[PDB]
Amino acid sequence: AKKDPNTIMSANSSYANGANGSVTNLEIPAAFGYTPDFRYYHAAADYTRRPTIAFLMELPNCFKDTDDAAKWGGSLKALIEMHSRTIDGLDYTLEVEHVETPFGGGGEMMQTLSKVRRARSVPVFTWVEKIGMPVSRFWNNYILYFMGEPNSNVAGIIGKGGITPAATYPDYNTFSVLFVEPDPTERYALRSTLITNMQPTGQGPEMRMSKDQTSSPEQLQISQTFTGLQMVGRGVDKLGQMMLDRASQTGIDLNAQPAFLSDREADVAARTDGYIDQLVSSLSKPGVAI
Amino acid sequence: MLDRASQTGIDLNAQPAFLSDREADVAARTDGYIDQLVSSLSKPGVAI
Amino acid sequence: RPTIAFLMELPNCFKDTDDAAKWGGSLKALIEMHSRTIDGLDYTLEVE
């Protein structure tokens, strides 16, 4: 197995500055000219997108005022990084604008660049409820005790004493997350996004109730939307690469892991009705004589 | 004025319900959900 | 060659019965000795 030494960019310069992994060379022949060449097909390998990963970077300061901030922090981290079944609404696409003027009466136009912009992310997480409904409790109580209460539009936590006068600033009740898309080997960060100023917006967890006894029960699925301020560039890529350097995969193997059970429980051994029991005690053992 | 009208101890998500128990006439009919279990169905026990 | 099934665990509801040993022994014998046939086991791979 050999390929052209010029297949991969060697310097990661020009438009490849700040890249983490390996980049193909755009100057080696492609298939869509006069005719393709089978000597260079290695560079015809294609891109495949991979799931995004979330890293919690900051915590609300309202958790400190509670009796147990450890529980709130751990639950928030678990929801963000493990329980997330689906994430969506991330985008920083570019947009351009121009102006026109007739270059004569024929029908042609002369175009002049005017402005350039970028898209905006609206994160949306999704979960599946658990026994006892901890996710809905978590989010609803977060809103009620840290954001507002409909009958007074005032946070319930103010019902304690000595809450900081600066409790109305975003750092009191907002957190930050870092989103990274790795490569197939989960070693390099191809794209990254830093979103801050997050807290629920719109509908909360659904609180519908109904009665129908002939019908079949169903699963509850939590969908929540969030606010955000987005930053993208090269420093974000460096931060994402540093985070991905952690969580190393050296020395692990998912096909060599021990079975989660080591033996049959003590109750099974107590029973004398099975495969091994018949050989051990039920069957005669006279020996083998030829 | 605003220092008064304190909000300490006030929790509207933990306030007791304005009704604490079912009405006395309602409990006298004995033809509801609880009543069938209390009086209608036999209770021979569970054996298995 | 034929597959062999070994019981590893019993349900905990067996302890809430009058005779848990009988339930456990019956389940064990059914899984191991009375199994006339077993089918449906598969862990094949697939590449897309």
DSSP tag of C46 = -
| B46 shares contact with chain C (CB less than 8 Å) | no
Tokens of A25: 């060379």
Q: List the single residue in C with minimal CA-CA distance to B48.
A: C17
Count interface pairs A-C at CB distance under 8 A. 41
Q: In what order do the strands lie in the sheet with A124-128?
A: A86-88, A124-128, A221-226, A200-201
CB-CB contact of A3 with A42 (8 Å): yes
Interior CA angle at A21 toward A19 and A24, to 5°? 85
| A29 shares contact with chain B (CB less than 8 Å) | no
In this structure, which amino acid lies at residue B22? R
| CB contact (8 A) between residue A271 and residue C9 | no
DSSP three-state, residue A115? strand
Question: How many whole angstroms separate alpha carbon A90 and alpha carbon A232?
Answer: 12
Tokens of A241: 């690469």
Listing DSSP states for A164-229 in one string gives -TTTTSGGGS-EEEEEEEE-TTS-SEEEEEEEEEE-EES--S-------SSSPP---EEEEEE--E
Nearest to A40 by CA among A13, A66, A14, A7: A7
- Helix or strand holding residue A98 (H, E): strand A94-102
The residue written with tokens 């019965």 in the block is: C17
Of the CA atoms within 13 Å of residue A223, those in its CB half-sphere come to 7
Nearest to A138 by CA among A189, A192, A200, A94: A200
Question: How many whole angstroms separate alpha carbon C15 and alpha carbon B11?
Answer: 44
CA dist A37 → A41, A45, A46, A78 (Å): 7, 14, 17, 50
Question: How many whole angstroms separate alpha carbon A60 and alpha carbon A38?
Answer: 57
Beta bridge partners of residue A194, listed in sequence order: A178, A231
Which residues from chain C sit within 8 angstroms of residue A283, using beta carbons? none
Tokens of C40: 């449906």
Which residues from chain B sit within 8 angstroms of residue C18, using beta carbons? 47-48
C-alpha distance from C37 to closest chain A C-alpha (Å): 15
Q: Which of B8, B9, B13 sits opposite A144 (nearest CB)?
A: B13
Interior CA angle at A203 toward A197 and A206, to 5°? 130
Nearest to A125 by CA among A39, A201, A13, A219: A201
Q: List the single residue in B with minimal CA-CA distance to C15.
A: B48
Residue A54's CB is within 10 A of a number of other CB atoms, namely: 19
